[PDB]
């Protein structure tokens, strides 16, 4: 909500990560009881570039 935290920078390459971050966002907005709330991205600890390298390691490991 306050702009771009510079930690959540998905590269122009590997833009498939957005479609998984949608599910990871919409998980907790449905698990929490009560009103489904508008949910905003806050932090990716290892960086957005190094986040999807873990997914690519899982894809090589199958």
């Amino acid at each position: 909500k306050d702009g771009r935290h510079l930690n959540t920078d998905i590269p122009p390459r590997m833009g498939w990560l957005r479609a998984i971050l949608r599910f990871l966002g919409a998980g907790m907005a449905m698990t929490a009881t009560g009103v489904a709330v508008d949910i905003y991205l806050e932090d990716i600890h290892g960086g957005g570039r190094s986040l999807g390298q873990r997914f690519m390691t899982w894809m090589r490991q199958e």
């Binding site: 510079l6 290892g46 960086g47 570039r49």
Partner: peptide
């Protein structure tokens, strides 16, 4: 101390390896 101890992800590795490498400058 833990608040300030967490202080571009590739430039951080570049500056860490920049700092960690050097030290110096019979009759």
């Amino acid at each position: 101390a833990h608040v300030a101890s967490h202080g571009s992800s590739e430039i951080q590795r570049h500056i860490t390896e920049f700092i960690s490498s050097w030290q110096n400058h019979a009759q």
